[PDB]
Each structure stands twice: as structure tokens, then as C-alpha cells.
Amino acid sequence: SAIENFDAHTPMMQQYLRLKAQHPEILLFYRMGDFYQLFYDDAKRASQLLDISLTKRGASAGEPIPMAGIPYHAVENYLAKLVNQGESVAICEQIGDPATSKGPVERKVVRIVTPGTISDEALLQERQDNLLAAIWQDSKGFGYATLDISSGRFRLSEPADRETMAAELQRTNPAELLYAEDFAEMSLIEGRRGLRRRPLWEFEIDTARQQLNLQFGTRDLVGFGVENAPRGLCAAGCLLQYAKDTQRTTLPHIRSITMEREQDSIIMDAATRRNLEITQNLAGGAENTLASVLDCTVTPMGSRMLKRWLHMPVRDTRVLLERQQTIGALQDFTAGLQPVLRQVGDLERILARLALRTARPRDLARMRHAFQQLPELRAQLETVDSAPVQALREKMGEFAELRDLLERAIIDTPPVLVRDGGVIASGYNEELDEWRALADGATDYLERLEVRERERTGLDTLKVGFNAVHGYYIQISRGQSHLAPINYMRRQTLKNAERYIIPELKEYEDKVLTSKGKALALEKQLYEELFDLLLPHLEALQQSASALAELDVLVNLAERAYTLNYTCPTFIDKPGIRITEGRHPVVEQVLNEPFIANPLNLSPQRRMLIITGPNMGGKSTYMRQTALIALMAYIGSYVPAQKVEIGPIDRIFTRVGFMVEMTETANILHNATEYSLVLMDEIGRGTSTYDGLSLAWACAENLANKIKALTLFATHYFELTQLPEKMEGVANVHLDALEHGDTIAFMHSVQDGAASKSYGLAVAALAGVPKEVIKRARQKLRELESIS
Amino acid sequence: MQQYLRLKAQHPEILLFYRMGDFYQLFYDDAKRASQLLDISLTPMAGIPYHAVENYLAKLVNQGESVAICERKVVRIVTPGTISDEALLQERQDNLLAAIWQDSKGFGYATLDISSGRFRLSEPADRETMAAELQRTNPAELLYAEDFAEMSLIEGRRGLRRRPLWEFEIDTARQQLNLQFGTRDLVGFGVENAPRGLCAAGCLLQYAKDTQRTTLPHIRSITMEREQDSIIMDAATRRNLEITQNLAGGAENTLASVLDCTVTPMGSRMLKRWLHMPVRDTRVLLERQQTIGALQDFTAGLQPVLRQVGDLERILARLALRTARPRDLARMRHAFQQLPELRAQLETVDSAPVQALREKMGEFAELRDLLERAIIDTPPVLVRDGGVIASGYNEELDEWRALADGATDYLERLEVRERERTGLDTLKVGFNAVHGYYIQISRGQSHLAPINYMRRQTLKNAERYIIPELKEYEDKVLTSKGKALALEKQLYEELFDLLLPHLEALQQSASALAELDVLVNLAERAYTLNYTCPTFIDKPGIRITEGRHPVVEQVLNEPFIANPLNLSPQRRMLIITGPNMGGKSTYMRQTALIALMAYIGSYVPAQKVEIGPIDRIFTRVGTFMVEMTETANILHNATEYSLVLMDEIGRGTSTYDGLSLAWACAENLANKIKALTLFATHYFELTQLPEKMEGVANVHLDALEHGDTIAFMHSVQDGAASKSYGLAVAALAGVPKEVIKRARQKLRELESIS
DNA sequence: AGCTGCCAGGCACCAGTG
DNA sequence: ACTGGTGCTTGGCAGCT
Ligand SMILES: Nc1ncnc2c1ncn2[C@@H]1O[C@H](COP(=O)(O)OP(=O)(O)O)[C@@H](O)[C@H]1O
Ligand SMILES: [Mg+2]
């Protein structure tokens, strides 16, 4: 192998290796003329991933250099293939002029595309958030931060233990996760996508405080409510440094950060989120989830928001009452408002492209279209007497001046890119109309010259055309070419035609080309100038989009409440849940038979229910629908019952029945309070007969007598139906079944008390177990029943 | 695209690829279904590039979709069960076409491997066996009749193909099958009185033929697979034993990942067929045993040679179909060149069956030499552009080539001549399709082009010209190359004519080579992995000394613990108590895997295995309802020659219900069915079973508490267990001390009545 | 509407003359 | 050192059929 010292390198590879050195573990797309190039292992890897040719750049001194590339104009399709696989890519461009550089033109990395910093519409899913996170660990707990680069939403939390951290990763589901190198609990994090090991120094607290204050223009973070939170600040500081390093521009839409405190929301553990099938079902799909039912938002930014609420229920009584109020007030207005809200589109994401100075012409066109909907929205919402609706109406704004600007500046349907022009409209800049008019008293001139020269020469094949490589020409066929004026300067020869130039045409070529380059250069100057006039209003524009997304969510929840027959729940002072004719929101829509509504009464005196009933009798569904009603109540939605009264809930824990069951259970026992809702679904496993049930008993007992949480405790262990007897706060309910001769009917109705019996043998027979075996099993059963 | 509609009507069940430019494009419901299947975008249009079409055919074909291609009319169709091109197939995985049909009596089933010509027919007697045959054979494409009643069997399957009833008519099937095989009746195949089976085989054969529009001379035979010739295993058993596929859908940590170090793709595919179909006939088994023992010493020598043989089976299919490409003939040649050496190595082996495989392997010396002379060392992928036929094979071809090379030589000397005369260092001769041969000169020098040069094309920095002299020799080069290209193709088609008469003997060779690869591998595995030769007894029984689980013992870096087993008619059920934690399950599954391997003819991971006949293996290992439904299947179908492994049934319902079921099953398995059974349980009350009845005994696993953990020992010991560990595992996991203390009190109180 | 092959714009290489 | 020719990815499209 060759000693690759600096001097043994060509000027090209000197520069290239300097720049790859600053990006040693990621693919570097390196601009040379019309191509992005890769070298060495980048080329080999790119070749395998992207399905392009692996070639060689020849070398005078040494071994050939592996090489691959793509034309600059095809870059975004390739960037998409890469980022979809979790690959980052540094984009290196030419800064300088080749004509004034002796050696290689100056080259800089201008951006890095990574899975959690993308903002382009082609690389994202419309209805799903794409978050960058950072995480780190102390001896005591975790700091965690999230950034949605394509809306500027920047958050910080400090999950106190392992399980809260598992729960947070599941909630936020980052596309890319920066973690510190000394991270101990790797089981939380390994086998996630877009994992990015970072050095310790990027989590340093003084640096974080410094960069965040600089980003926000503040002396301190007191006003944001995070000066208190160095654990979280350390993560947020890593995150911000990564974001600035990927974008390499200012980020004026990141103007704020907020701490998500434990107390602010209901904290659902990892099992609970999975078990309720909120946005993801139990097989990874998005069908048959709570979102598949509640989500008929008409804008992308609203679909995202609704899913954020579903996942993070709020404990602020005022916010909830305000949301409920809104939903009752808009019930009659949904049909008129939705088709209009739809037309606003995904303004949030456009505003981020505007902030990053990346917005394309169709973004400004959709921004303009959106502004055009604001008066119709304003008019429709005026009539609605509800202060919260009016507060949104106000916050959404109007932006008359900016709407006018975009109507006058850009044409009706502009092209996808500004690169080829045809974007700025006539009337907006007079210097531009003058340059376009010189390259447009042009198509007409070439025709009159064609006809004039055809008639003058007498040569009827004479045509005038253009060719990018050779320029304008007069063409005569081969058979007539020998008759051409001797004045005609030969320019391009073809198999069956000859092409010429004369000074009149050459002078007209020189004027059309230099005035096209002036028209385009000035279009680009003016289009960048649209950003300068929009940007000052960014703060108010971002508030408008969030208002519009909220509107979309609530208008939606109003239509859902109507169409699906939901009521307004009420909040009470003490823990408790009173449901009348309650229903599983999801199961009631997918079942092709009537859903049996069910009550529930939980209070501080009636705090644990031991639920029995046969397998397939409805014990899990009844538990889940309780949690779903609680969750819907605490995002502000109407709920799928005929009446619900509900007290404060701090946390929802779930255990759905090895070392893992007993560990999850201990978490519940260490961290549940009198304000928690606890769903235990057939827990207690051991290696012998009574082993695991005894544990279940002692656990039920600790939940009832010490923690005093509100617990639904589904079991197959009939012995646990003795607990009410011995234990203040516990009672039996059950799922009713009937045995009419040789079969079982599942009624799906909760009744008070323990069931008459268990039905393990009935269910057994239903499953086809031979009748001779069930006969002996009953005989044995009666032996056991005679014990007492 | 008003013309697209009329071509979609022609085949409305199949996806239509529709050529335009570099792409094939799909519209309406084809585009929708194709974008979710393949990963591509919408517009209703999706499209694929031309240079990768075979890749997207392979992916759609792998998912059960037939595909028609249009170039204007439908010129080619690929169906999932009838492909044979190597780009579309997976090297180490069988691809079957199947037909199924149903009588008032029972089922008819047929399978075909279009590449090998392996054609099978069965008549599964009931619902459960039919389900077992479908999961085992896993056809890529499945023809069924319109009136098929039991749609629950096939509903979920990829590549379903609804078919008219008349395709399953018996007299037509008999007739087409007799014609295909050159026979007057099917007695010589032993299927003459299997009319349900034949109806399935006739529909299948018709469909194959229709998709090929070609004779299928490699399909010369059919066999019938009978119930009693194999150990039956339902899907759940097959899945639990992790034969070819693991529970997560992959190929790792599987029985095949450990046993299948074969060296040819055809041998690997045959080994996997053997693993999934253990046979009851000990005659066949003994021969495989003897061969495995006789080949121990020859293994290091044989395998590097056999690896060079490659996939002769699949290359041969393409010879049968007349689609074999130059590297297929070149690999066939390469395989013929190994036979002398394999013949020499095997001559010494003391084994009638190895000597039979050695005869059947053949030599084909005359075909070896034919392709040595006919084709060059490393021919190009396609015949299309020539350069495949060797120089010296045909005199006429050598002359056209010399005439081309002499005109090509002339034009190189013309280049140097014109370059010397004019004094123009940039002068050169090139060639392309538009201008044929031309003289190029750069733009800076082109103004000194001789006046006899006729300009033809201006480039940005060059001018190309012609002269009469140039066009003259172009004509020599081009006409020569054209005659030699047409001659190469005619000579290539002639190789097929000379090779194909030996097709039958060549399919025997590839098959023998495949078997040898299986056995040479199994012999290397027996010797490498310390396996031993099992013996067979006349009555049911399993006696294992230091048995091991073959996958677990290679996969984990912790000492594997070997265990005995003694099952006989006097001792036919073991009640296995103690912690499970993997140990009971592994012990039970290694029992099944040893039995399965004994019944493949392999050596087995043990110091000693004696084993009686086994008709079925049932392993219900690892909702309550699905657990009870699987138990139901055992109790309805197991016999006194069955092996039954059951993992702690009763869990998921109440203590007394579940204990009553477990008790009553055990009784039934021991007193009525009399299977050989390992009955794993958590119920201590079941350890009283040995006192209450004959042929039942107690064993157990225990654990050792030390330092701050627990070591769950994997050693099976005599007697009931006397410890539970649920509570000890709760303490370790951090369940508060006071909770455990209370659980201990309640445990004692609960167990004390019992 | 298809198929072949020049071109884009960087920089290096290479071979002939200062 | 300086002059003028070459080559290299892929995708667009001219220039021939
Ligand atoms: N209230 C109800 N009305 C109608 N069907 C129900 C109801 N609750 C549950 N089910 C259905 O019955 C089946 C069993 O429900 P499940 O909650 O799993 O019972 P369990 O957990 O007790 O075995 C599921 O298909 C479920 O959809
Ligand atoms: Mg359940």
C-alpha cells in the first residue's frame, strides 16, 4: 500500500481528503463540474447502495482511486434512497470561480443531510413527525431533547428512571438519536435507527447554556423555564450543535425551547402505549388504531398535532375545559370549515423551508393560496361565540400585505425550481420585463430571418434552428448545400444537412444568450428577495400555522364527537372513574356486531377491581377502553360513553402477562401513586402450581393497601376472588357468560361480584378437545371442588 | 394509451408491464398493487427501469404475482411456479407449482419443480394432513378448482390460481400424463389407481405447458407420496422444531444452518427436502447410515471437487427448455471435468450405495470434449454478440474471422498512413452505427484536412470525414463479422441438438451428484460434531444416552448439558416438573430433533440412540384457545407409535380447570393413546400420577442459588421437583422484600392443603 | 417513437515541444 | 515550465432510423 502523505497527492485529492477528514464516517458527495463524486470506500458503498457504476480515476503516482458519481441535477432522488436507509451525506459544493482559480476551485461542505434534519417535502411523510433527539445519562437519570427542524418545535425533559426513558423514546420515536459516548443503559437505545454516538464534550453544560442563549438572543433561559434543568440542557445543547452543523445557515424558526415536566401530562409507560394501539397496532401497522378512528384532519400539520396530543394527554384543567368548549361550539360548523381548512395545506413545513431559505416556488404558491383562505376562515369563525375559538381566529392572522406580495411576484402555477426561471410574474420588476422582452422579440425575429433567407437564396430546405452545443444556425440540406451563399460561414456539418452562421445571426445569438443570463440572474436575486420580505413576519406566521393546525384538530374532534356519538366528560377533585354505557372507541368500529356498552365505578373506597370471566369474555377490552376513555378525556376530546366523570390521573401503567414480567411489576410497585391508573392483565407466573398466583396476591395486596392506586386486575386465578373479603378497597366484577347445554356464549357485560364458576373446561371443549377427555377433567374438577 | 385497455382485457388477472422508453409502466389497479408490493411511487402510474426489470420480476414472482410484459402485444409472461431463469430463482430454495382439488371422498394434491422435473402426487386423507402438506411443500403458485369447498386451507396463500372444473377431469389427465411420459399407462409409476391425485397432476401439467409453450422433456416421471412412508408433522410442529425456518421467519439458528454445509445449491435443496420428510422405511435409512460411515475418510478430498460441479440440476432445466446461455454450457463443461476425479476418489469406498452413485454419476467424456472444443474458456453472458465459439472448432467460421481481422488490420494501417501523410497527430479512425467508419481530426487541425475528405459530422472539438477507401473496407469488416455472428449462433443451436439426446442420463448424473453432496456433507457433520449411529428396534421406544440439542449446542457459548432419556412401552410418559426457563423445552425438542434425524438417515448428537418406529411427531412447545386447539389435535390424531411433547398445558385458565385438563390429558396419553410422551408441567399435583398408574414416571430440572443469582441447571433428574423459584426470581428482579414475604406466607398456605 | 452516443464541467493524465 | 489532446460516473436529448 502506498504511503499517502500530503505531498504524494494531486491538488484535487489534497482538497478532497481535507474535506473528507471533517466527515470521516459519512458519505461525502463532492461537486466537480456537473457531478457529485465519491472516492475510495464512499464510492464502493455508494455503488452498492445506489446501483451506479464503480469506476477508477487514473493516477500517475500510485494506485487508481475508486470512483462513483451522479449528475448534479439527479441528486435528490439519490439523497432519498440514502436517507431512507438511515445514511447521512455531506454535500460539498464549489464556492469560487474556476476561471480565477489557478489550482482547484474552493470547495465547502454547505449542508449535511441526515435522517432527523431533513426538511424537504420529497423526503418526509406528510402525516408523520420526523424528530431529531439527543439523549444522555447521569448517575441519577436522563436528559433528553427533541427538535422538529421542519417546524422549530424544541423540547427538553428529564426522565427520572429507565422505564420513563423507554416510554419517552417510544412516544417521540426519533428518526435520529444523538447519544453520549459514556451512556450506560444501552438496552434502551441499541437497535434504534439513526443512532449517532457523540463525544462527551458536546454535552458540556456551560457550552449548552452559551449556544442556547445565543440561538435565542437571551442572557439566560429563565424566561423559557429551563434554567433549572442542566440534565436536559446538556442534551438540548448537543442537539442544537448538531442542527447548526447539518444546516450551516441561521435557524430563525428555532426561537424557543420548553420543558416537558412529569406533572404536566399523563405519563403512559411503554406497555400502555403499545397495548392501547394509539398510532401503531400490535403488528406494527397503522390500521385499527385510535388514530385510524379519531384522525380525519384535513391538513398534514393537523394530523401530526392530533397524534402528539393522543400521545401526551394534558393535566391542565383550564386547557381541557377550553378544548371541550371549542368542540361543543364548532359542532355545527365542521362541514363549512373543513373544505376551507384543507386548502391551507401544510403551512408549517413551508414556513420552515422559508426559514431555511430553501423554499421552492410552489411553496410560496401554496403559502399564497393559504393566505387566500384566511378571510373566508375569519368570516366563518366570527359568528362562533366561544372565547377560545376567537383567540385562535385572532392568532391565525390574515397577512393582507404578504398575500398581495406573492400575487404580484409569482405566476399562477410556477415550475418546481427557480433554477430555470419562469417564476417571477410580469409587472413585478421593470428591469426584468425589459430583459425578457429582448429575449422574446426573438422567436419572431428568427422566423422572419428564416423566411427572408429562404426566399432570397431560393433554397427551400433552408431552416433556422438552435443547438446548445453549436448555437444558432441556418440549415440547408446536403443536396442544396453547394448552392449556399459563399458569405455563409460553416458551423456544423451533419449526415444529410449543412449548418451555417452569418454576422446578423451571430450578433442575435450573443444578445439572446446574454439577456437570458441577465433575466435569470435577476429572477434569482428577486426570488431570494421574497425571503427577505417574508422572514421579518416569521414569528407571526409560525403562530398562524399552529393556530390553523389546532383548529383542524378541534374541528375534527367536533365532527368525530358528533358522528361517533361521544359526550363531554367532567373532572372531579379526587381519583375515580365513573363511566355509564362505556365503549371501546376502536373495537366498536371494527366489529361487525353491536358493541355491548359497560359501566365502571372506581373511587378511593372502591379502588381495585378483580375482574374475572372466561377467556374471550372481554376482560382485556374492558380494561383498555377504560384507559382510552381516560386518555381521550385528558386531551380534551369528547369520549365514547353516555356519561363520564373522572379525577386526576398522573400515570398509566400496564402489565400484560419471565424476569421481564417481574421487573415491569416492580417498576409499577415502586412508582405508582394514589393518582395512578394501573392495568394488570393476568400477571403472576411461577414454576409451580401456586408460585405465581401468590405473587399476584401479594402484589394486588400492595396495590390496594399501600400504594392505593386505582387498579383493574384481570385474572384467570379464581383464588383472587377472595381478596375483596380480606382487603379494604377491593371488589369483584366479572364478564358474564352463559352455558346452555354443550356450549358457551360470551355476553360481554360487566356485572358486580365474582362469577359463579370458571369456564376453562368449557372454552377447552369449544376448542375441540375430545369429549372423553373433558368428561374425565370434570370428574377431576369435582374432586378439587370438594376440598372445601 | 387507449391501446393499453385492450391488452389489459387479454389477461385481466395478471399485472401488465407496458414498455415505453427506458421503462415498463403499470396503470390503474396494477400500479396501486405494484407500488405497495415493490417500493415505487404513484402519479395512476408506477414504473420500473429496463436495466433492472428481471429484479422486479423476481420480487413480484417471489410474492405470488404473475406478470405479463408488453412490447404492440404481450410477448412474455412469468408465473411464480413456472420460472427457471437463474435471475428469478433463489439459489438454495425450491420453487414449486402445486395443484389441489377435493372430492366427496378426499383431496388430490400434486407438486412440480419445473427446473428438476420432480413431479409428486398425493391423496391426503383429511383436512389436517392436507394443511400439513401445504405448509411442508410451500408452493409458490397454487391451482385450485372453482368448487373447492375447504377455502380455509388455501385462503391466505400467495399465488392462488382459480381454475375451471374441466381441467381436473380424470380421462383427460390420464391421457395427457401418458403422453408426456411416453407410456400407455401409469402402472410403472405406481399411480394408476390414484384418480384424485391424477386429476390434480393433469391440471398442473396443462398449466405448466401453457405457460411454457414448449415441450418439457425433463419431466419424464411421477411419484406418489404415501401417509405411512413418512413421519407426519403438522405446521405448528414443523415451525416449533425450526427445521429450515426459525420462529422469526429467518434461516439462522435453525437445524439446516447447522446440518447443511453442502457445496452445491442442488444438494442444499435436497438436504432440506430430506429434513422436512423423514421416512419410516429403515431399509433406506440403513443405507444412508452406511454411506455416511463409509465416506468419513473421503470427505476432505471430495468436497472441493463437488463444489466445482455447481447447480447442474437447474442448468439442465435450461437445456431442456432450450434457454441455456453460454455460461450455463461453460459450467456444465466445468462439471464434466470433475467426474473423472470423483470417479477415482470413490472407487475405493467400501459401499454398494456409493458405488451405485458413482455409476449413475456418469462420465460423458464425448460431451466434455465437445464443449472443450466448441466454446471458449470464459464466454460472455449472452450469445447475442458472438465471441462464444472457440477458434479451431469450425473452419468456415475461422475464415470469416480472419477476413474481418484483415480488414480491421487494414484500417489501423490506413490510420497510421493518413496520419503520416497529412502530418496531423490527432488523426484517427473510429466507428459508430450512424457513420460507420470515419476519420476524425480535431477542430484545431481540421482546416488542413485533405480535399478528398468528405465532411460528415461536426463535434464540439472535432470533425469526422469519410473517403471511398474507408467505406470499402467497412464493407469487408461488417459483412464478415455478420456471417461469423450468424454462424456462431447456428453452431450454438447445434450444441443443443447434440447434448439433448443424453438428457435422461444427465438428469441422473445431476441427481446422483446431488445425493452425494447430501451424504458427503452429513458424513462430515457426523464426524465433525461427535454424532453417533442410531439403531432401530421393532417396538416403540427411545433410549438416548448423553443426547444433545444440535442447534443449541453449536449456537450458545455456554457448556451444553447432555441428558438421558428412557421411553419404552413400560415407561411411556415422563412428567417433567421444575423451572422451565428454556431447559424443559430444549430437552423436549432435542428429543424430537434426534428422532427426526434418526429418521433422515443421519447420525445424531448422542453417545447412543436406540429408537422404535414413529408415525408422527407432535410438539406443542412454547391464547389459551390456541394452546387447547393444538392439544385437541394431538388427542384426536396421536397413536401408540406417536411421539408427543407438551409444554405446561393448563396455563391461561384457573388453577383447578387447568389442573383437571392436564390430568385428564396425561391419563389419556398414557392409558388410551399410549404415545411416547414428555409431559412438561408446573402442577405438583400431577407428580402423584405415577402412583395412580402404569407407565408413568417423574423427572425434573432444578436450579442452584449462589452469590446473587440463580443458575437454572439443565440436567434432568429422577423424581418430582421439591422447589419453586417464582419468588426467588421476583426478589432478584426487585419486587419489594415485604411483598415477597407476604407471597411466601400465601404460597405455604395454598400448597399446604394439597 | 426507439436506439446510440455526444455532452455537461470539473481536474488529472499523458505526450510532444521550451 | 506551456499546448492540446484523452477519460469518467448518469441522464438528457439530438440525430439518425
Ligand atoms: N363489549 C364488547 N362487545 C362486543 N364484543 C366485545 C366486547 N368486549 C370485547 N369483545 C370482543 O371479544 C373478544 C375477546 O375480547 P378480550 O378483551 O380479549 O377478552 P379476554 O381478555 O377476557 O379473554 C375480542 O374479539 C373483542 O373484540
Ligand atoms: Mg385478555
PDB file of C-alpha atoms and ligand atoms in Angstrom, chain A residues 615-616 618-621 623-624 656 681-682 714, ligand 2:
ATOM      1  CA  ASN A 615     -61.097 -16.427  28.008  1.00  0.00           C
ATOM      2  CA  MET A 616     -62.635 -14.398  25.116  1.00  0.00           C
ATOM      3  CA  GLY A 618     -63.950  -9.329  27.295  1.00  0.00           C
ATOM      4  CA  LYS A 619     -61.693  -8.679  30.254  1.00  0.00           C
ATOM      5  CA  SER A 620     -58.823  -7.071  28.303  1.00  0.00           C
ATOM      6  CA  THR A 621     -61.131  -4.914  26.152  1.00  0.00           C
ATOM      7  CA  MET A 623     -59.515  -2.609  30.739  1.00  0.00           C
ATOM      8  CA  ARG A 624     -58.223  -0.964  27.543  1.00  0.00           C
ATOM      9  CA  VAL A 656     -49.852  -7.801  30.207  1.00  0.00           C
ATOM     10  CA  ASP A 681     -53.682  -8.304  32.875  1.00  0.00           C
ATOM     11  CA  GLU A 682     -53.355 -11.897  34.081  1.00  0.00           C
ATOM     12  CA  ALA A 714     -57.945  -9.111  35.321  1.00  0.00           C
TER      13      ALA A 714
HETATM   14 MG    MG E   2     -57.057 -10.502  27.517  1.00  0.00          MG
END
